[PDB]
Design a protein around this ligand. Structure first.
Ligand SMILES: C[C@H]1O[C@H](O[C@H]2[C@H](O)[C@@H](O)[C@@H](O[C@H]3[C@H](O)[C@@H](O)[C@H](O)O[C@@H]3CO)O[C@@H]2CO)[C@H](O)[C@@H](O)[C@@H]1N[C@H]1C=C(CO)[C@@H](O)[C@H](O)[C@H]1O
Ligand SMILES: C[C@H]1O[C@H](O[C@H]2[C@H](O)[C@@H](O)[C@@H](O[C@H]3[C@H](O)[C@@H](O)[C@H](O)O[C@@H]3CO)O[C@@H]2CO)[C@H](O)[C@@H](O)[C@@H]1N[C@H]1C=C(CO)[C@@H](O)[C@H](O)[C@H]1O
Ligand SMILES: C[C@H]1O[C@H](O[C@H]2[C@H](O)[C@@H](O)[C@@H](O[C@H]3[C@H](O)[C@@H](O)[C@H](O)O[C@@H]3CO)O[C@@H]2CO)[C@H](O)[C@@H](O)[C@@H]1N[C@H]1C=C(CO)[C@@H](O)[C@H](O)[C@H]1O
Ligand SMILES: [Ca+2]
Ligand SMILES: [Ca+2]
Ligand SMILES: [Ca+2]
Ligand SMILES: [Ca+2]
Lengths: 686, 686
């Protein structure tokens, strides 16, 4: 089918996402509204339920509010049954309106709707070519105190009605009981509790398989994307087996939230987008967009350096979800901030690389500080605001112009307040110029672009003071003055003769899984797909057409591969690297090693004979291991995704700068379980 | 040996060439100086012999003038025996001092020296790590009038003293007798005479074989490169069979002169570079450099556009020879003009991509107009000029820092008067910042770089008012003020672990010849070289070390191939593409089709079953064929290089944009000659 079908659950860079807090969007059904102290239909107390639901979203798809805007993906609040208690916190009553305090991951939150109401949402979203992404927060259940079993619902977890257990009297260790995080360390934030949320224990096999059974249930019900919550606060090894579970079952675009501060460039964050099997919410993009476009704490050079840098650091930059604000940040639009700032910042995000996500109500210039003030009910469904209009005009360019969906970003002109950048994919190009200065016009002299000769009309129709572009000989454009606050988008589209790959999804799966390669120039005749130098042709290509091919991963050795396409005429595409073929189905195993004594700067790592363990290469070893919380030094521990039901060989080692110290002895061996969890507890062999 | 060795004849990106007009450099042997009419020892008359010779260049390698400047290659006037005539042109006497009026391509010009002095030049140069590039001028012989046999030497051509023929009464048709070129079309500039020069006819098997035998004997005297003259004015197809003759016998770096004027961009120019097997003097670069640093008829965004654009248009940009002036244009330094512009532009060229050439005497701020004023004798052998010191500081960096020699160019900061660009290859980095404004200081803010945090000396030692750079977190540099006329070079080197290809020479050749791949990170142990999915290893990798491997071209089908290296440890490199494997040795065949009547913009083309003929792909067919000078429309003719000694199958087609009207009938067949030429003459088949 084409790369732009609503059935393409694997790649979303042709989409624009509208992030909906279900409770604050629309109350389509008042008979499902909570009662008593859990409810506030005036929505003046923002920690209470206001009554918004799935029928209210079906209604704004149907009446065209969402479709009118060009929105093609909806990201909604976690669908799962939540705790019913009203919790008092320092006098303030609080409810589970946000969907984040779960108790049964196999049932719906009935304030949102029934199971039949979720199905009706998927079906009318799909009938209108909209994809449905759900939040999923497998890190925890609900507010709990083991000391006080009567507080809230004591973190209790049920499997489709059947109690599994609570936080007080956790004889099964379904939950972590280490106290709360102080956020000092990644380890500390993983194993300790977030605030007061009862931390699930993913190393318990019942928690492991129930959470994996539950996500399969939501995939069976037709969801197309998953935003997983607090990715920083779960074991990365467990997350990779969770990701292999959805990728080997029904791969859908999955991305996670790892929060990043203002000028924080974090290595682990990038490693996580590059290696977990899910992409990330692009906080680096988001924080620099607000520094340049909102707060003027950085300029266009900062903007350029971030777009250039991120194209290298994320192995698949076209998979990162970009945004200018969301539910954890103060709204972009301030009380005294010019609306042009919001409008340009949205235009930027809509024509930039990635998968743009728009927080509900941006188009209605909502302002408000941090939680809960950034989650007010949206004030109006006016369809004629300037912001509604810039998204209406630009969001469809992601489906029609493959340069916006998949192209590289080239800065063609710049100064402190102006950047004009070019997105290019094959022969398709889009050019956008923006002048963030609202007093001073900009004299553009010497712009050259890849546009063929012509007089390009600004796709924004002049609503942000854009203009026509007259491109002469050799893509050189005639000089113009960009208006103060001006933003213009100029574009050109054509057929590609060369295969050009713009995106592949999933990026990690075992042999036999159908991968989806999207781009242009594949031609209509079944060509060749290369995993390294292995070639799939014929029947292993389950589907071929100019924009999309679907093909089964061949039975190659686990490891990571470059993908390449050849059309039926033998012309070959660009290389799409970092594809991970897995040795098979995964299981997460805890590795505990006692008496691994280390000097300062020395850490224990794990390596082994399968690609998941680095294939005996010390540079690709699993680690640094942890040694503070679940076990303390010199015991080190780590949860590592590993091939299920196989005997693997492995050894530990210590690394200090360039020096590697392997443990002596023979190779340790271990037969992994087929499902669940396992722990290997061993002692340093000198 | 390593990439930077003086024995690397295939690639020159690590070199700095010094273009010497042999006659105007140094007279080291007066006894071989011309007498009386052909000579002027005061060299007051720039059209007569002044005396400069190969012995004088040997003295300048020996006494330290050239090696002290960091020059690593020398390009000298054509070595070949020229006519002895003093020609009159308007009562202005004129001699062959420039070496361009050949008589015999197998003897030396006695004013320069003997074959014995030419061996001494090769040997003193190599002994001092300087490569020797000779001009070769195969388009023509010398001024000739067929009407008047006594003018000059009637363009007579000798074969090692044995007369072959003169222009008057050329019965064995050695020359073209179509009149002179008005430069109206490429076809007209090729087959008609350039000025009064008896134009050689490459379709004559005698001239085709003699010219190839002569180039081979200078490859046999140990020349390291060849600048071939007037590449525009000879048939592509013949120059390709000539390139295949050099590359299948003793590959050395060869590049042509295809003159190009200001703001001029020819597609045929970039097609020649990309498809001939030779590269080109980079007139695109040189013309924009003079506009920005000499003449002020463009600014930094223009420079920026040229750098960005040449990087995608030139398939192998690292092989283009750059310069800011030469013998066919006015010298860059203007009389009583600002020296700092010369110094700045010299520093610009020295740190930019390609292979830089310096016109002799630039370091002595030689002024002069067009021919012959730009070839006055070098007036000083001063080693302390700032232009001398600038070349001495920066020329070495092309051997030491691979970012300068092979790296990509990326603008990092810019405005009308300032560019700071960064060269990047692996983690080796060079950042050069130039302020062409000689009056205004520039404040740089927002410079983000790829250098590690630290403070960086200007390698020019501040002689061009450059400064010390301090780099903080994430490559962001501290605010600074680039002086008026400030030029500053800051750099970072570190060993590459993983293999990176920076250059490949030759780029076109039959199976069995040894190519040179240069870069970093290849390691000390043989790994694999791919030509397509064809892995080449062991005995065929003739040599392998970290910066250079040499390997024999596999017995693959004729076609263009991507080259990729995987070091012993399996880490694979970037792809170097557009490599052409010839089906075999080459002969230029003239194809002539009669009665091929076309429509509006319908052109005739040739295609056949070898890769040389596009392998039956209409989108790759040879053409559009010619039809004015040698044969007239509706007869079309084209000189195509084809594999020697086999039955090619061909057909002709007409292309109306995307319509291909094919000949009917059956596929034609012809057995090519093994050496020499042939002409196939046929009529359109409906
Ligand atoms: C449960 C919580 O989940 C999401 O936020 C995550 C982040 O994705 C995760 O990376 C981490 O980020 C925090 C960051 O480390 C810290 O420096 C910054 O100051 O705050 C970030 C956000 O809290 O932590 C949280 C996981 O705890 C959602 O985006 C959050 O909205 C969501 N919040 C819940 C939790 C509480 C209390 O149970 C409610 O007050 C809140 O309304 C609800 O949304
Ligand atoms: C004497 C020596 O004994 C063990 O040797 C190591 C290798 O040195 C190391 O490269 C590693 O190689 C992997 C191998 O490439 C792979 O094919 C195989 O299947 O798996 C290996 C890793 O499991 O492993 C081998 C052993 O299999 C020790 O591990 C070495 O450290 C040891 N050398 C040092 C270190 C210590 C250990 O504390 C001393 O006991 C020893 O005397 C000293 O020589
Ligand atoms: C033999 C001659 O060849 C080289 O220079 C040539 C170019 O190869 C050729 O393309 C042509 O360039 C002109 C270009 O094609 C045209 O479109 C442009 O507008 O103008 C260009 C010239 O201004 O002509 C040049 C030379 O004009 C060498 O680089 C030359 O040095 C070389 N010169 C010889 C030839 C003559 C004629 O007998 C002497 O006057 C001259 O001194 C001598 O050096
Ligand atoms: Ca409701
Ligand atoms: Ca956790
Ligand atoms: Ca002499
Ligand atoms: Ca010619």
């Amino acid at each position: 089918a084409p790369d732009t079908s609503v059935s393409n659950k694997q790649n979303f860079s042709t989409d624009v996402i509208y992030q909906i807090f279900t409770d604050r969007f629309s109350d389509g059904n008042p008979a499902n509204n909570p009662t008593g102290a859990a409810f506030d239909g005036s929505c003046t107390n923002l920690r209470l339920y206001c009554g918004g639901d799935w029928q209210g979203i079906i209604n704004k798809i149907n009446d065209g509010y969402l479709t009118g805007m060009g929105i093609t993906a909806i990201w909604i609040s976690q669908p799962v049954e939540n705790i019913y208690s009203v919790i008092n916190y320092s006098g303030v009553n609080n409810t589970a309106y946000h969907g984040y305090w779960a108790r049964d991951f196999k049932k719906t939150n009935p304030a949102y709707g029934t199971m039949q109401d979720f199905k009706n949402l998927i079906d009318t979203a799909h009938a209108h070519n909209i994809k449905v992404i759900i939040d999923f927060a497998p890190n925890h259940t609900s507010p709990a105190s083991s000391d006080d079993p009567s507080f809230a619902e004591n973190g209790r977890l049920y499997d489709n009605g059947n109690l599994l257990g609570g936080y007080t009297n956790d004889t099964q260790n379904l939950f972590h009981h280490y106290g709360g995080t102080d956020f000092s360390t990644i380890e500390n934030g993983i194993y300790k509790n977030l605030y007061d949320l009862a931390d699930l224990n993913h190393n318990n096999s019942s928690v492991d398989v129930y959470l994996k059974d539950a996500i399969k249930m939501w995939l069976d019900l037709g969801v197309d994307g998953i935003r997983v919550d607090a990715v920083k606060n779960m074991p990365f090894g467990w997350q990779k087996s969770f990701m292999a579970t959805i990728n080997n079952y029904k791969p859908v675009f999955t991305f996670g939230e790892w929060f990043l501060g203002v000028n924080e460039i974090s290595p682990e964050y990038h490693q996580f987008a590059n290696e977990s099997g899910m992409s990330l919410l692009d906080f680096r993009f988001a924080q620099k967009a607000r520094q340049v476009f909102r707060d003027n704490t950085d300029n266009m050079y900062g903007l350029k350096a971030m777009l250039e840098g991120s194209e290298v650091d994320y192995a698949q930059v076209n998979d990162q979800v970009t945004f200018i604000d969301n539910h954890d940040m103060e709204r972009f639009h301030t009380s005294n901030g010019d609306r042009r700032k919001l409008e340009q910042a949205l235009a930027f995000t809509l024509t930039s690389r990635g998968v743009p996500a728009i927080y509900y109500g941006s188009e209605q210039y909502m302002s408000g500080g941090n939680d809960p003030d950034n989650r007010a009910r949206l004030p109006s469904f006016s369809t004629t605001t300037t912001a509604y209009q810039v998204i209406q005009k630009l969001a469809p360019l992601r489906k029609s112009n493959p340069a916006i969906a998949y192209g590289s970003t080239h800065e063609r002109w710049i100064n402190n307040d102006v950047i004009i950048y070019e997105r290019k994919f094959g022969n398709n190009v889009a050019v956008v110029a923006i002048n963030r200065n609202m007093n001073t016009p900009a004299s553009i002299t010497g712009l050259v672009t890849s546009l063929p000769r012509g007089s390009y009309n600004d796709v924004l129709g002049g609503i942000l003071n854009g203009n026509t572009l007259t491109v002469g000989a050799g893509g050189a454009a005639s000089n113009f003055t960009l208006a103060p606050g001006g933003t213009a988008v100029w574009q050109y589209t054509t057929d590609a003769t060369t295969p050009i790959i713009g995106n592949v999804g999933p990026m990690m799966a075992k042999p036999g899984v159908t991968i989806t390669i999207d781009g242009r120039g594949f031609g209509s005749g079944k060509g060749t797909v290369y995993f390294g130098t292995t070639a799939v042709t014929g029947a292993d290509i389950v589907a071929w057409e100019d924009t999309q091919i679907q093909v089964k991963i061949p039975a190659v050795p686990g490891g990571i591969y470059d993908i390449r396409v050849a059309n039926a005429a033998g012309a070959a595409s660009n290389i799409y690297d970092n594809f991970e073929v897995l040795t098979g189905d995964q299981v997460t195993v805890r590795f505990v090693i006692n008496n691994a004594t280390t000097a300062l700067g020395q850490n224990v790592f794990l390596t082994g004979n399968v690609s998941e363990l680095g294939n005996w290469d010390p540079n690709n070893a699993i680690g640094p291991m942890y040694n503070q919380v679940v076990y303390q030094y010199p015991t080190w521990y780590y949860d590592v995704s590993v091939p299920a039901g196989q005997t693997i060989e492995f050894k530990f080692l210590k690394k200090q700068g360039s020096t590697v110290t392997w443990e002596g002895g023979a190779n340790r061996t271990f037969t992994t379980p087929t499902s669940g969890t396992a722990t290997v507890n061993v002692n340093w062999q000198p």
